[PDB]
Design a protein around this ligand. Structure first.
Ligand SMILES: [Mg+2]
Ligand SMILES: [Mg+2]
Ligand SMILES: [Mg+2]
Ligand SMILES: [Mg+2]
Length: 156
């Protein structure tokens, strides 16, 4: 296989030394799979913090979008990986990126009940008044979902 297909595979699987190698030997850091996912997307999704650091150090596009408009920060926020959320934000991730449904990382964290993530996104400039395409804010999702603590952080 092409260096980029391997990198995607390695990233998803958490193979740190294999990702480290591929990058040192010129694999496309932003290689795309069938749905537009990059290595970064996959590492952020599957919780591979070390691979996220490696990728970012080798110039990964921190704000890459897949076919659904989903960024690595959306995945890290949705799936609860607070230390990856922190790292991505420190590397210039777009805190208010909207996916195809209009959801920001904040909306995704609110949907999934991730409080410490909500608190960290709000700390780095998340737009608490952002409406998704359904016309709802992160708060409204909290109410519908039924999350008292999160409903509460969102309205301080
Ligand atoms: Mg991002
Ligand atoms: Mg983003
Ligand atoms: Mg946000
Ligand atoms: Mg927001």
């Amino acid at each position: 296989a092409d260096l980029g297909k391997k990198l995607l595979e390695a990233a998803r699987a958490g193979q740190d030394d294999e990702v480290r190698l591929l990058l040192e030997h010129g694999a496309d850091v932003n290689a795309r799979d069938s749905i537009g996912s990059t290595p970064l997307h996959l590492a952020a999704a599957y919780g591979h913090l070390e691979i996220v650091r490696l990728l970012l150090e080798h110039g990964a596009d921190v704000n890459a979008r897949d076919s659904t408009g989903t960024t690595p920060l959306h995945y890290a926020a949705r799936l609860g990986h607070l230390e990856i959320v922190r790292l991505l934000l420190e590397h210039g991730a777009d805190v208010n990126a909207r996916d195809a449904m209009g959801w920001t990382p904040l909306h995704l964290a609110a949907k999934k009940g991730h409080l410490e993530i909500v608190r960290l996104l709000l700390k780095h400039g998340a737009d608490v008044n952002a409406n998704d395409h359904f016309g709802k804010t992160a708060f409204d999702i909290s109410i519908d979902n039924g999350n008292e603590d999160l409903a509460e952080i969102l309205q301080s």
